[PDB]
Design a protein around this ligand. Structure first.
Ligand SMILES: Cc1cc2nc3[nH]c(=O)[nH]c(=O)c3nc2cc1C
Ligand SMILES: Cc1cc2nc3[nH]c(=O)[nH]c(=O)c3nc2cc1C
Ligand SMILES: Cc1cc2nc3[nH]c(=O)[nH]c(=O)c3nc2cc1C
Ligand SMILES: Cc1cc2nc3[nH]c(=O)[nH]c(=O)c3nc2cc1C
Ligand SMILES: Cc1cc2nc3[nH]c(=O)[nH]c(=O)c3nc2cc1C
Ligand SMILES: Cc1cc2nc3[nH]c(=O)[nH]c(=O)c3nc2cc1C
Ligand SMILES: Cc1cc2nc3[nH]c(=O)[nH]c(=O)c3nc2cc1C
Ligand SMILES: Cc1cc2nc3[nH]c(=O)[nH]c(=O)c3nc2cc1C
Ligand SMILES: Cc1cc2nc3[nH]c(=O)[nH]c(=O)c3nc2cc1C
Ligand SMILES: Cc1cc2nc3[nH]c(=O)[nH]c(=O)c3nc2cc1C
Ligand SMILES: Cc1cc2nc3[nH]c(=O)[nH]c(=O)c3nc2cc1C
Ligand SMILES: Cc1cc2nc3[nH]c(=O)[nH]c(=O)c3nc2cc1C
Ligand SMILES: [Cl-]
Ligand SMILES: [Cl-]
Ligand SMILES: [Cl-]
Ligand SMILES: [Cl-]
Ligand SMILES: [Mg+2]
Ligand SMILES: [Mg+2]
Ligand SMILES: [Mg+2]
Ligand SMILES: [Mg+2]
Ligand SMILES: [Mg+2]
Ligand SMILES: [Mg+2]
Ligand SMILES: [Mg+2]
Ligand SMILES: [Mg+2]
Ligand SMILES: [Mg+2]
Ligand SMILES: [Mg+2]
Ligand SMILES: [Mg+2]
Ligand SMILES: [Mg+2]
Ligand SMILES: [Mg+2]
Ligand SMILES: [Mg+2]
Ligand SMILES: [Mg+2]
Ligand SMILES: [Mg+2]
Ligand SMILES: [Mg+2]
Ligand SMILES: [Mg+2]
Ligand SMILES: [Mg+2]
Ligand SMILES: [Mg+2]
Ligand SMILES: [Mg+2]
Ligand SMILES: [Mg+2]
Ligand SMILES: [Mg+2]
Ligand SMILES: [Mg+2]
Ligand SMILES: [Mg+2]
Ligand SMILES: [Mg+2]
Ligand SMILES: [Mg+2]
Ligand SMILES: [Mg+2]
Ligand SMILES: [Mg+2]
Ligand SMILES: [Mg+2]
Ligand code: NA
Ligand code: NA
Ligand code: NA
Ligand code: NA
Lengths: 64, 64, 64, 64, 64, 64, 64, 64, 64, 64, 64, 64
């Protein structure tokens, strides 16, 4: 059985690095992370110092 | 990193109050709740006494 | 077996009351109405006197 | 010909009042506003004092 | 309040049995599981021995 | 001209049999049923005895 | 209250005429038809003599 | 950079002519119109004399 | 088994004729073309002489 | 690089067997078939003898 | 009240830089730009010299 | 007439480079490649050595 958690990663650099940010967090706290599906992307502007790219992913992990 | 939990709140009063019901539950058990996105709304009729409005939300919270 | 009818209710008050308007109509003419799913919402402006909130619902009823 | 502008209204009270907020703004600056279609709803939490309901609408107006 | 977890069940037999696989896992670890909504189906081929049917479900459970 | 009715069939056995349940009902009451399109699938759990698979279909029939 | 019926009109001429075909049928059998929304278009080829354009519409009518 | 404006054109003749109606309006008031994407089609019936076909388009234009 | 190819037809006349353009091409090179489903429509403006209507279709054909 | 072909399989038995029908055809003619994603399901009724279940899949295969 | 404008940015480098291109243009001409939501991405090939990455964003700005 | 092929490119570097990977493959085997539309993005994790970014594109090419 796989389960997915819905995470939004952030980066001041790129959409790819923002996806990595979310996956890194998942891998910190979950075993058997196997894939991620991008579900949205955006840019936070008017409450940060530098533009912040955001990539939201369903991160899938194998249960057990 | 933000994470979202997918909650359906309920109310005998309104769709807005049903959204509040879900957010209240999130705030009871989670720190740093920052926003909610409505993903569906409906009304339960034929297994309740009074119509029950339901509002399903992705409730976003900042991790750490 | 359930069947759904696609109804748009209206209200000069709120989206919740517009949903009730549709459900009330279904309950007038149908037995065993069991739930409703919101599929769209809108506001009619430039052919009514007061803004009219509209809520479109699939109203589900149990057949037999 | 109709044109639509994509506006997010806000309210500390309800999704309906947040929709009104957007429509009111459109009517302030546009002639012949004729309808609005709800495209999203959400709640801003962790950068406001009180929860703020938001309703995003395409507000349609007749050109000329 | 209901909460949903996003699970992908697997089966070498059918899409229905793959849905059961996910629900069974939810029922192992959660109380008050009340319904499941199918959100995707697929078949894993080129890293398994026999075709494996997969059914992804939002499994809803009542909180408390 | 074709018309469609939106029916949810149920089965304690499978998603395919739940689709048949809806189609059977359509064929009981309608002439010239010609096809069905699956629009959703789900499983009712916590108000039935055995899991009940549900398949919602637009059932198309030729008018006249 | 408005209700919608989901009709597929057909024409050997055009998508517009296929939409008219559905609306004409609605107007034959329903009072207070007020609008139609196109939901799909297609072309039937390999079971007709000439290509047949099809336009599927939700036809809305005012109840009462 | 391209920008899009969301326009609904109308015609008593066809969906194609309704799309032209919107594009013509864009070209009246905008320079460097480069393409249009159809996003919806419909027919206004019960507040016009003759059926009016409507085609909603995102009309893209190159900025500068 | 059916297979679909994703083709965009073009016409200086209409969306219907643009759909025919794609289907004609499919029929030139494929046997047993049986139906087409419209998936998008648009208009190319700023790199053609006359507006060019485009209709994108999944063209289905029976294999063997 | 992966490529996908869009195939509709058929079965007089089940949606799962209809998916297998499409995958079997892909495996007959393609090397390195690796997965399939269900994109639609339906039932052909009024031009076949027995109901025919259909499952449309994107069948993915690794290029080279 | 927030308003959104629908802009497609371009870059010969990356999808992230194409998003920046659109946001930069918005910030040139608008006050209080607060966020952007990616709605589409693509690559222009056969009318440019080098591949051009394009990222379409709804750029949100606070009115007043 | 344009045709599209549905390709998933891969890269250990970025979503942009994964899109290039797919386009490069199309250009190897097809003439008159004119544009690509991103339809999905993801990251393969638990069967590769380094995270592999994937970008799925419809690659459009002009027929003849
Ligand atoms: C990055 C980002 C910020 C946002 N802020 C937001 N802030 C807000 O008050 N309302 C919103 O709807 C909203 N949407 C956002 C979406 C994105 C993608
Ligand atoms: C409130 C609500 C109840 C429902 N009950 C339901 N009960 C059921 O047996 N099948 C369903 O598909 C179903 N859907 C529902 C959807 C909503 C929005
Ligand atoms: C309330 C409402 C009115 C509308 N009127 C409309 N009137 C019209 O001529 N064309 C339309 O597309 C249209 N859409 C509408 C949508 C909504 C939600
Ligand atoms: C109200 C609201 C705020 C938001 N803030 C947001 N803030 C953010 O940093 N990223 C987001 O994606 C985001 N989305 C939002 C969506 C909504 C509906
Ligand atoms: C079963 C299945 C396997 C998959 N594998 C996959 N493997 C991969 O490398 N990229 C993918 O996008 C991908 N998608 C899949 C989807 C499904 C439904
Ligand atoms: C089978 C089923 C039951 C459901 N019950 C439900 N019951 C409920 O109170 N709210 C819901 O949203 C809901 N959704 C359902 C969906 C499905 C598919
Ligand atoms: C016109 C048309 C015919 C079709 N026939 C069809 N026939 C069939 O056996 N399976 C299908 O999925 C199918 N889809 C169709 C869709 C359209 C739009
Ligand atoms: C042409 C058209 C008119 C409409 N009128 C409408 N009028 C209305 O009161 N409510 C609606 O939702 C609505 N929708 C419409 C949609 C279309 C496409
Ligand atoms: C006809 C048409 C042309 C287009 N050109 C385009 N040209 C471009 O540089 N970027 C685009 O996104 C784009 N989209 C188009 C869509 C359509 C429907
Ligand atoms: C099985 C099937 C047959 C169909 N036939 C069809 N036949 C037709 O004339 N028009 C259609 O739109 C159509 N759609 C279909 C869809 C499905 C899923
Ligand atoms: C970059 C891009 C160019 C395009 N050109 C295009 N050109 C065209 O003639 N028709 C189209 O549909 C089209 N779509 C496009 C989409 C994208 C994303
Ligand atoms: C990269 C990727 C791998 C995947 N693997 C997958 N593997 C699997 O067994 N089931 C899946 O649904 C699945 N989906 C995937 C999606 C993506 C985007
Ligand atoms: Cl989710
Ligand atoms: Cl419907
Ligand atoms: Cl828009
Ligand atoms: Cl496709
Ligand atoms: Mg930096
Ligand atoms: Mg988002
Ligand atoms: Mg914010
Ligand atoms: Mg009360
Ligand atoms: Mg729901
Ligand atoms: Mg129930
Ligand atoms: Mg009042
Ligand atoms: Mg509507
Ligand atoms: Mg009107
Ligand atoms: Mg107050
Ligand atoms: Mg939003
Ligand atoms: Mg076995
Ligand atoms: Mg999936
Ligand atoms: Mg049994
Ligand atoms: Mg459902
Ligand atoms: Mg003729
Ligand atoms: Mg259809
Ligand atoms: Mg047929
Ligand atoms: Mg005339
Ligand atoms: Mg519309
Ligand atoms: Mg001409
Ligand atoms: Mg297109
Ligand atoms: Mg048999
Ligand atoms: Mg289909
Ligand atoms: Mg360069
Ligand atoms: Mg686009
Ligand atoms: Mg071009
Ligand atoms: Mg490297
Ligand atoms: Mg994918
Ligand atoms: Mg895999
Ligand atoms: Na989730
Ligand atoms: Na219906
Ligand atoms: Na817009
Ligand atoms: Na394809």
């Amino acid at each position: 059985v796989f389960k997915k958690v819905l995470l939004t990663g952030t980066s001041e650099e790129s959409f790819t690095a923002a996806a990595d940010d979310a996956i890194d967090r998942a891998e910190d706290t979950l075993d058997n992370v196997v894939w991620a599906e991008v579900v949205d992307q955006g840019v936070e502007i008017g409450a940060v110092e530098e533009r912040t790219y955001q990539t939201e992913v369903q991160v899938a992990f194998e249960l057990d």
